[PDB]
Design a protein around this ligand. Structure first.
Ligand code: MQW
Length: 253
């Protein structure tokens, strides 16, 4: 692995790693309370034998620049972070894969960037969502204070998340957890669109997902393919991420 830095539109430095390979160029986008270490820890990275893998830390996470404001965590800024990585590696074709909100980011990048040949969204769909202001603010308060890491650790432990997902939360600055949560009130609720006709769009979720309807909506509206894994909930589906990586490898091959 080599490390890289690029700058987003708003000047935020975005840091990541590049794992060279002779195959397709894949860009990996982590979830909110995560960083780029999850790709190796989940076994997803090992499941892609040939790809040139680019894994970024989104703003405010990992080794990327701090933000600390709700507006600085607007979805459009994350999209800019990812597009800056596409610029650095200069390819005409990329395949994006994102987990949870990272999947939503990947879908939005696909909508706006014609260099995205494929986008895979794990446990996030493409449809418009309702984002209640009170629930957002309550969650932001719960994650940003002294007890915020413990709150998330307990939440994910009680819901059966894999250990790497439980542990990643404590690596995120609490102020960035709060600001990222509040960032949802700046555009995150709009549906995503297909970027161009030849793009391959894939949604993945738990077969037991309590809200599969919007995943089927994306099949109809975007021509996305839906992949299911054996799990009762989206959080538990994260235990299957390496297995999903093997199926991604089959597409890239
Ligand atoms: C419940 C709580 C622990 C959890 N909060 C987090 O984890 C982090 C901590 C800081 C904020 N965090 C967010 O996530 C932002 N908060 C939310 N987002 C919503 C959501 O529904 N997301 C979906 C994916 C999705 C996205 C876009 C479009 C479709 C689907 C989802 O499946 N979420 C599961 C939780 C579960 O299955 O019950 C997880 N998502 C985390 C991640 O993205 O990394 C890993 S687990 C809407 C508004 C996007 C809600 C709510 C308060 C607004 N709170 C959560 O989700």
């Amino acid at each position: 692995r080599d490390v890289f830095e690029v700058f987003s539109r708003d000047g935020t430095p975005i840091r990541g790693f590049s794992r060279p390979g002779p195959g397709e160029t894949v860009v990996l986008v982590h979830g909110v309370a995560m960083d780029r270490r999850i790709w190796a820890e989940s076994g997803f990275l090992d499941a892609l034998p040939d790809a040139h893998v680019l894994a970024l830390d989104l703003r405010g996470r990992g080794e990327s620049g701090r933000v600390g404001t709700a507006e600085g965590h607007a979805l459009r800024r994350y999209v800019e972070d990812v597009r800056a990585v596409l610029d650095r590696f200069g390819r005409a074709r990329y395949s994006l894969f994102g987990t949870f909100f990272g999947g939503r980011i990947a879908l939005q990048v696909a909508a706006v960037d014609t260099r995205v040949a494929r986008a895979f969204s794990f446990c996030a769909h493409a449809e418009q969502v309702e984002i209640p202001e009170d629930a957002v603010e309550e969650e932001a308060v719960a994650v940003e204070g002294p007890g915020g890491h413990a709150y998330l650790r307990d939440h994910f432990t009680g819901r059966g998340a894999p250990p790497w997902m439980v542990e990643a939360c404590a690596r995120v600055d609490p102020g960035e957890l709060g600001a990222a949560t509040r960032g949802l009130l700046h555009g995150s609720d709009r549906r995503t669109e297909r970027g161009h006709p030849d793009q391959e769009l894939v949604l993945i979720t738990a077969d037991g997902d309590a809200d599969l309807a919007p995943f089927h909506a994306g099949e109809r509206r975007l021509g996305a393919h839906l992949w299911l894994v054996d799990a009762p909930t989206r959080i538990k589906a994260a235990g299957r991420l390496a297995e999903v990586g093997r199926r991604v490898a089959g597409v890239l091959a």
